[PDB]
Amino acid sequence: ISKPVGSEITSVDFGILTAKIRNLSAKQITNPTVLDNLGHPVSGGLYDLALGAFLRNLCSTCGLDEKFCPGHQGHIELPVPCYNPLFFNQLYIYLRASCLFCHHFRLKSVEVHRYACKLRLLQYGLIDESYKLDEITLDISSTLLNELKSKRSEYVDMAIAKALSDGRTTERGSFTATVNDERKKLVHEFHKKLLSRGKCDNCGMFSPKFRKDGFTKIFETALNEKQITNNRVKGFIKTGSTYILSTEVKNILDTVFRKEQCVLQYVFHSRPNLSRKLVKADSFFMDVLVVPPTRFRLPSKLGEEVHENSQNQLLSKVLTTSLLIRDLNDDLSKLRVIFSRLMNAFVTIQNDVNAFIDSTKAQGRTSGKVPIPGVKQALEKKEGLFRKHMMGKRVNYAARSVISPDPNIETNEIGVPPVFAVKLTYPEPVTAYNIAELRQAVINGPDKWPGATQIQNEDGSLVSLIGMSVEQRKALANQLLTPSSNVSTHTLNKKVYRHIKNRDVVLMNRQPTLHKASMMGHKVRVLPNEKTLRLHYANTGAYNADFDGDEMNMHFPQNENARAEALNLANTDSQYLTPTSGSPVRGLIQDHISAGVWLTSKDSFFTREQYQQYIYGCIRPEDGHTTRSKIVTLPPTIFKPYPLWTGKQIITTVLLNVTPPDMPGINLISKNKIKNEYWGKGSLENEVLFKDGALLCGILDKSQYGASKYGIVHSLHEVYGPEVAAKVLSVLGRLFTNYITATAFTCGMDDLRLTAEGNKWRTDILKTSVDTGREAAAEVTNLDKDTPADDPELLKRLQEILRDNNKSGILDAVTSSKVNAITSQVVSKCVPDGTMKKFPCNSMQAMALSGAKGSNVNVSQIMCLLGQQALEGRRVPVMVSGKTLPSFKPYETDAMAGGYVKGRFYSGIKPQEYYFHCMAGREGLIDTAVKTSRSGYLQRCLTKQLEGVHVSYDNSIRDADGTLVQFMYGGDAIDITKESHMTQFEFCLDNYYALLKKYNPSALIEHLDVESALKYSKKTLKYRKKHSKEPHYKQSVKYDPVLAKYNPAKYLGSVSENFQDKLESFLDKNSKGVNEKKFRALMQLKYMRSLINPGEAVGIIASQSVGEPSTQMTLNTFNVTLGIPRLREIVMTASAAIKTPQMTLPIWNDVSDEQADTFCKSISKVLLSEVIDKVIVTETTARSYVIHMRFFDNNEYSEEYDVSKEELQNVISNQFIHLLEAAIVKEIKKQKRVEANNNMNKVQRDRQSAIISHHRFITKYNFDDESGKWCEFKLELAADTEKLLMVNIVEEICRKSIIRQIPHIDRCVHPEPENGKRVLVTEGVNFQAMWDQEAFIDVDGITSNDVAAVLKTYGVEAARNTIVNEINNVFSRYAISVSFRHLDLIADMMTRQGTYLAFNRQGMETSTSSFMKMSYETTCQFLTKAVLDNEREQLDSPSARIVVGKLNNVGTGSFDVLAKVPNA
Template identity: 30%
Template sequence: MIFGIRKRIKAIKFAFLSPNEVRAMSATKIITADTYDDDGFPIEMGLMDPRLGVVEPGLRCKTCGRKVDECPGHFGHIDLAMPVIHVGYVKEMKRLLKSTCRQCGRLLHKPIEIPDAEGLEDVTEAPPEAAAGEGDDEMAIPVFREDERDTAQVRVCPHCGADQVKITLDKPTSFREGGHKLTPKEVRERLERIPEEDLRPLGINPDVVRPEWMVLTALPVPPVTVRPSITLESGDRSEDDLTHKLVDVLRINQRLRENRDAGAPQLIVEDLWELLQYHVTTYFDNQTSGIPPARHRSGRPLKTLAQRLKGKEGRFRSNLSGKRVNFSARTVISPDPLLSINEVGIPMEVAMELTIPIRVTPYNTEVVKGMVLRGPKNYPGVNYVIRPDGRRIKVTDKNAQNLSETLETGFIVERHLVDQDIVLFNRQPSLHRMSIMAHEVKVMPQKTFRLNLSVCPPYNADFDGDEMNLHALQSEEARAEAKILMRVQEHILSPRFGGPVIGAIHDHITGSFMLTHRDQRFDRDEALFLLSFIGTERDLPRPAGKDQSGKPFWTGKQIASTVIPRDLSIEYKASVCAGCEVCAREKCDEETGYDAYTVIENGVLKCGVIDEKGIGAFKGKILDKIVRDRGPDEGRVFIDNITKLSIGTIMLRGFTTGISDEDIPPEARRQIDDVLQKARQDVEDRVEAFNQGLLQQMPGRSVEETLEVEVMKVLGRARDQAGNLAGKYLGLENSAVIMAKSGARGSMLNLSQMAGCIGQQAVRGERIHRGYEGRTLPHFRRRDLGADASGFVSSSYKSGLRPTEFFFHCMGGREGLVDTAVRTSRSGYMQRRLINALEDLKVTYDGSVRNTSGTIIQFAYGEDGIDPSRSVRGEAVDVDDIIRDVLGVEVLEDEEKAGFRYGEYEADMTSTQDEFETEDEGGDEDFGGD
């Protein structure tokens, strides 16, 4: 038993409306297809009959006497001249027709084979208590899928001996028996003949359903509230699609009746009957396959009953599973590095539109009165006042004075958003719990939402035109809950991989690299300028030394240390680490000049740089440690400070990159060309060997495949060599290299493709072979298997591509785009299905996973009961870290042996690089904006 649930749904019963029920619930019979008369009044017994409900304000319903919004509307009905088949039930009808006799209507089984109530238990393995303990209504009703197949074989009725003819469904709504077409009337007669006792085995409860009701003789007409007409500015009436469709039905119904009664030729009557069937069918579902959709005069297909419910825009998905909300705002986002990660900048316009209800108490009466007095147009004011009797009064400049005076304890006042209010901030697609986080309001000028750059990764936001939504919370509980559970700082560690998702990105990393790399020196003014970025008051540390001219200087490491918590100690290899054979550890700086071994002792950066591995989103180890050991408050402060410091540094020193960063000396260019020429020759040789049949086949591969593999290997190596040659001339004095090595943006591969050689283009993981007969482009000879003819691009992005290369590059690029498009749509659908399946599961206080009915799904969440966002890269405890903390000894971390370290986790997940992939991040950048 779950507490709080008083009523449970025990069963849901589905039944058909009988024609009598349709007529009984009908407020009026509808006979004319006309809606309004010349004076604009609804016609009696027309589709807009006033007895069907009220839509116009001020009028009263003729059926129930209530006003608009009080009267729910009332059904009417149309008596059909001839019976018509209901599209929704054709499958069911086919099943029934097939398994019953065409003459006597009995189930096509020998009498003994028809299981009676006692026999059922055996056949269906129904649990004994289900049949014994409960009444007939709840008895498990078996549906005989197998029997259907059996009966299809029966040729002669075992009851009356009538020959059976095979019945086929002629989609969408007609049945055919042998060659003869069954009219709806005949179908109805047959269904009428099925005796009640044969219905139960067919899965139908005869107490509530008669099968012949599937053939319509009376059509319910929905109330006008369901299909309101709209009055355009021009004064014209525009009717709802459903009304249009019902008009069609009525018109044809009328003509059919007249023709039939006048004894018109069979053919004409049948045509009209068919037409009526078409209209009724499209009235239910206008996308029935096999018939053309009914269209509006403009050519737009009508939205009929099924279309109102189905699909993403249907009632279920867009009005029941999801709803539009009040107290929300949406606008473009832009960055503000000086905001805290917890904050969000809100335009004044938004702050004055969104409100928060405040209850007037003796303690706040004066303040609230002041706000009401300012009215809705002076910030921070009040838009509405709600009196204790529930009346809402809009505050205007005129009544502000008055309202302010009448304000008393117990009133509720809807005041403007002010700084520090808690709001929810969201960016679609909401794939994460981090896609909706709680922020503190900071009201600002200008018209965009402003957010700290460090929170871009969890939202996956950028500023190329992205828009985000904001929701003002309306209750104290909601605000408290949001503040505790949803605040940005509570989501620094991701439940996805137990590391930080919020951290430094791009320029933050470059800046922090520039601040901490090797021996950066800053004079007094510079040091103070940097520290001024961190709002809080703190003393300038003691200068590190004096330069030649005797002026004191401070080191970047010293300044960076000011924001590192006092007693933090950590040691790791930074992103810039070149992965030397033997690590020089603390002496990395002297020996290699990379300064890649980072040591922080008691909050002092002893050596090494702080780069992506230290503070980056996804990878930052310092960040990880601070948040894990000291909690989100300190984590937030650290992120705010270190990023501000980095921004300060990058502003102070200046940083730029351009295509000249990829300049390499002509000497290097020559070397690269040599390498590429050699590789090309190498490929030629192999192709030659292949043509002469001298190529040594690789195990498990054909000769052709062997050639491909080898050529790919040669060209891949050539690209790498070219990259290395280019890289030799691109040192850490180069801005682009700084970004690549520190992990701020781009990779060395990107650089080598710009400076050196782009490399092999691939389509479907192979060199390019498609195109003309025997060749890829007319520029090549047939059967040319050489490097250039199969998509090897030896140019660099900087030098520009030759036409053939450009073409191949486009082929590869297009595949990348298509792949990402396909991936996103597929993963979106998978996400939807997963969410639908898992939405009601929760972890209870005892650690077990249960659904809403209390059924246990898992006895301990994740089998180990560990919250992944509190875990260390998925592990419950970080033994190395504990040893270090307790003993003060660093456990040597052998990256290779350790295998999976979460620093590489992101790379593992996103990397689609194989040896000759060209774009390292696929469709990562799309500059098209949203």
């Protein structure tokens, strides 16, 4: 920190190096061999000593040694100008668009000019005048075109000058993401008109079309003999696919770029080109290579063998082929076959420079195990450069080890081993106050722990203390304040690198870091006698760690700016609530839970010696736990027989001592997890009660001091602050450890046993399960009457069910839900009642009821039975033979044979049901291995877009370049980790005085206006209740909300309108030393102190609050796409074709259920295949085909599908026979390369002969007009055609002819009404059609989940409301609460362009930051788009500031600290 930097980098320009790289490097490289004998580097070779010092030789350029040479660049002269393979697609577009006769493009002189004149406007920040340029129009002569060109260009000289005379644009031009969209639409369109033309327009003589291959060649295909005759009519006024040599592309494109300089001055420049350079075509080819410096091209080594570098093997091969084409360059100076090797050399001088840059753009020779990587393969992967060594560096001053538990250190502490404590050092500058301690550190030296390893002198020279003795350290600790002779370093002072101490801090890290609470900041507490990092149990739920061998990374920060941020921003005390939903994550975990159900029990009675021992066991005044410096106690609750204290009265005493004395006690009314009936008749131990800081009723659980919301530790966090709530977890961590050591807790075999009364109960209920398998199987086969299992008419149906995946799904669901009832009858009769040991003594139940460990499902499977072993949602799989195991009869309708385990883990499971339980055990393990890979990439993909998104100082949520995303954070600007008790008005009234001197208003009413926002709020409250019966579109807009008028942190009373409604609803239904006027003043100051802070990274948090709970929903089927694959269509990929799109149609309240079910059938599509029983085709042989149809009975398809027989006549005779002959003719063209009814009337005869005339070969036709049971016709083909699979043709056409299809809609269904909502669910989306159904549908309430189809019909704000409703449906299914403030910020990012943009490459394409895009994926693809743009990176996104090493602009880099000097 004593070597400051002055000048700093602020923006990076991309460009192309010209031909005069030769000026910066006169150290050309010719000899391809890198060394010679005697190990020396040969001159002119790739290890030349003018490229940097090498092999203990000085540099020929720097004159410096290997430690201090920077290294320098050389260059390889390519003999012929090969093209750069990055820019090869972007010259093949300009090659395929230029006319070889006139050297323009194949667009007109005015249409080229128009894109040249709109892109000039868009390199300024003005988009409106570009669309108003096409407004300038009016036997075309070339004088009226040159008027228009001087008329359009006159407008652009005025529109730019007007906006520059205003403040709309600057001289360097305005450029934003929405301007980037409109430029990437013209240039993509400009490369679509130029690409698709045939002839020139300033002449007629036109060029032959081109061709290419895999990036090595370009061909000029033969212009056919029609078009040369179209050329020579004008020019008067060779073989097939001739090759194009690389130099003759340059001689075309040099002359084109000289002519179209105007349009290409704005295609290639997105800011105004102040340097007024020229876009030249040499920039696409490669005149020279450049050799990287020798330091970047060092030899490789492994074991004891040195090898040559990768970047020399690809780069000598260019230089031998450069030599080999000079070897053959002498074979024309004295002068067929040698041009077959000359042209062979140009392909391989191209294919070597192509294989130098890329490696996938070559051909190679053989399977050389993915051959030698080029310079693009060093950049584009997970590994490589831009993601492994710029976003993912390795660090100094860091240690990792296995973690171990400790309840004796604090919650905000780590136990550093003495192995790590004598290695990690901190550079501490020696001053007048730490000289007494840094002298002692140097005396101890680098072996004794309060010590130091080396000192740093004022000239920066280090002096290591390791080899020194006790005398060279004492005689060097005495010189720490001696000023040096030098005057340049008279400012500085020495730095002693002391060891880590108990006042240092540390970033700690669990390695899958899915959210920001997995990397917190601890205080060091150095322990003896260990080698393991050592942690407290409050932290192990935050890191998601357990003590099974997990390792954690310990980082030790090396300056005072970072120590002020591991103590104040990332410490564990401020990480009590997670930002995902506002729920606490820090609390006591397993056995401190199960000790508070015994300590705070009603049986606990401690004597005087014991009561004072549990106080001082956890609260020590010496270590600063108290607030009074004298431990105060309580009177006993029993006086006369013997003085005894209650166990609840200890929890009172520990809160009496650790809370501040001036504040009054806590007041809380909460619940437990333990029901009242486990304690006896008339107990009240479910009600937790704190009155004035005294626990008066109820035991303490996971629900009080665990990681649970609105407990006692969560409530102390609100009233007293995070520093007190972190002490109470430490005090209770020591209280329930000394009580455990004095009074232990065990779990034995007797805990797991049912009594003989209750063990007869589970036998009698499981006796009634032997019939359950058949009865569910007799139900799905639609038999009855208890048909026996060996019935041959039953076993035939079970085989029919077995072959279908549908029917086996029904039989599984019926039988599983029928045997889960018997599972639920055994549990609901036994587990409180049939057990041998009742609740307090039965520790197996008390670990499950308290929430200490396990559930009631674990206790039921131990004591009662396992239950149904459901596999992939369905049931146990089955062989081909109808056997689920070889032990069972085929098609066995036993419940046990389907996988129902009637055994428990106490008594044992049989070998058959041990095999099904291993099936269920493995699907929980293969699904885990595929779990984390799914949601890992979903979180990475969010944290690049939503990554420079932060709260600004005007409370608007903005991106890094300044583009606005939201206007407040969620509409209320409230931090999620603050709004927990904000709507808990009963809690804030019971603790009014203790909460008053926290939100202290007395020292605050002179820095903020008070009455301006309260006055405006009552106008907007009174006006809004007068208009509440109106719908939302008839809402008058006089009074915009008070947050949009007043800053919430500047004006008291400016308050989100939902908080104001809840606050007035509380004060008007609750009349309770506290007024209502002063309670308004508290809860409006509390809104003002719970606001989001400016600089808060709400983009990372919103992405970590979605990707992290999505590692929790990887499971299978429990109709709509569920869980992560639904979440990968909305968020990722922006699917315009959802797999299962739906539509929810709210029917009216006067349309009946029959008229609803009738309306369902009038929507769903009806194929012609859905009314056919059989199709009998008789082929006799001219050829014939008598196609006979059998429909179902007319009272069956008119009832199931609402299809009359007059429809089938019109469907077959207008649609089917046309489609049928379009398939028969198509096949032949790809081949020659009961009863009887006759005596038709006049209607049927006229129907026949007309349709014969309308078709080609049908010749007979009849349809059942009386009953609607059969159609009948006779396709006669020719007397020449061979065999035709007619029945395979007819089955494909019957399944594609529709009788009645409203388009894009497959099926309507009437589900169960959820909460009275009579709705209809439609498999498919068509909003346009459902508007025509207003007699049955509330069309102003129809709701889809195809976001791309709500966007097209209803617009961008309706689509944005769909996204927040469809991400919510994913998480609310899995009972996962995420806050809507995260979901609104994800939705307002995806709708930032008016469109529905994804989080992927294609959504990221319209952005400003180039390094954000390069670091994500396809690095050199985005690099191509940036270099051609000559794009100035502004270095504002956090992915671009870590590259250049600039300070990040989010959080503590969102402002500047300026020091105020007193003298003039």
